[PDB]
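ASSEMBLY PREDICTION REQUEST
Request ID: AP-0331
Submitted by: J.K., bench scientist
Number of chains: three
Total residues: 548
Priority: normal
Notes: Please return the full assembly, not individual chains.
Input sequences:
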Amino acid sequence: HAAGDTLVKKLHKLANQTIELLWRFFEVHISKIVFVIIAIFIANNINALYIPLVILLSLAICLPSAADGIFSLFMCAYLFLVALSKMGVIVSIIALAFQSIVIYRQRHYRASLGLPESMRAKVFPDFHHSHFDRSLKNAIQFLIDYGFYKFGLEITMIAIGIDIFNRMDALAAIQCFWLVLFALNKRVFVRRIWVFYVIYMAILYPLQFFSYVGLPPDSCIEYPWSYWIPSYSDDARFNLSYLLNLSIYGVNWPSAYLIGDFFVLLLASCQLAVFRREGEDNDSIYNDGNFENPQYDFIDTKKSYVDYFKSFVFHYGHWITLMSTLAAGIAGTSLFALGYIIFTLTMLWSGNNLYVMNSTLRSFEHTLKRWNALLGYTLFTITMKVCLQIFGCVFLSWFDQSGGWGKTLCIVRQLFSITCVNNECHVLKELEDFSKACAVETKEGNIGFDVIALSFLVFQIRIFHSWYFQHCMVEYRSEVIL
Amino acid sequence: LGMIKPDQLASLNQALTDSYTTRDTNSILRSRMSVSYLKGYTYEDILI
Amino acid sequence: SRKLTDIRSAVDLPSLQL
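STATUS: Completed
Returned structure:
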């Protein structure tokens, strides 16, 4: 009947929506779903076959060119030939044929519509993409477009920082220096230096892969004598090697380690490569104003639901969210969190009293005060966290000797050097009774609270000096006056 | 057939605490349970 | 210039008060 016809047309509409989803996921992703099956099942087996095709992908990123497309066709067949010779990998056998199917479906769409054949990241009106705003699909469209410049930097920054810091070993220090140099200065030439450092990282990732697959399953040939086999004898020296990732045979290497760094090296490289392309609007205004009178002007938009509440919470974020993540840091109950304690209260009192009334000839100095005060502290504490756990895991002026020296060193480890935290490691009997006597809470890792804090403070300090918050202080001063 | 001196009970209770290890939380939980079991009996309800 | 900013402020403030 008519109800049957309407049900059929609803099913056809659903089929059209699903077809649109298939097309958009075909065009927008392309190699992501392949690259991740590549790594997830890489972790699963870890036998040589992966080596040729893992160095392959990293160099493919290091050859950002149309030659990259020859390596794309390599990703197409490489697997088919090696899989046939060796006879869920059988699913990958037909999955590479799906790449040719993707091209086949592209040709089908070419003859259907009378539009030019080109890639389209923005499927629905381009004007709405410039809107950046409320009410609809433009939310996921925003996830797409501002991944290119503004939200993309913060997303990749939080991704790399949090992932590597929760890994909490080796990499932790090099990328700690990366963080120090990135967050300390603000510059595009330093971004080009960072373009040359990510190029180095793109080689260093296959270095880590090769370190994990350095030898066939087992033949007991060489292991650089465990990094110069120092002079000590301990699981501490065992873990010195756990740390310098040199060879190490009897280990199921953490799959999470490889998945994290691989995926977060892919995202960062893509983000930075796009970053080099176009311009920016973050800090060029500040140098113009520097060269109590901020003069960026823009409309205040319309209060029509969603946008109202989004911009309203954006206003409140200065008070509740950032300081509350610092308060989670307060609950970190550490000697380093004590510095946070009498930093946060002063921030509340002084900052409120100071930029309620737009302090004269002190707004720029106050925003520098906030920037340095709540970025340098969190970076210094996050940098030492990994360094001090390195110190604890290894041997240096051991803290178990003498009576007065023993007491002083026990107090020192009580509040400062604490204990190492890593899932797999070992200890000996003497250190066992030493830790029994000194005692510790064995829970320190920063993944609980420091990561969200740092995320908020960077994400908002790149906003606290830009965009409409510069126009927001007008509301602050008007409210104070009235 | 006789009761237990408080010295022996104190020695047993003291030995129950130090049985664990520094890292594993399961060892701590086991020690807590074993100590909680003993405290329900006074020295006047234990027979050697 | 300055007068325009002054009148803009003296127009915006009563609107906010209302």
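REVIEWER COMMENTS: The helical segments of chain B are 6-17, 25-38.
SIGN-OFF: pending second reviewer
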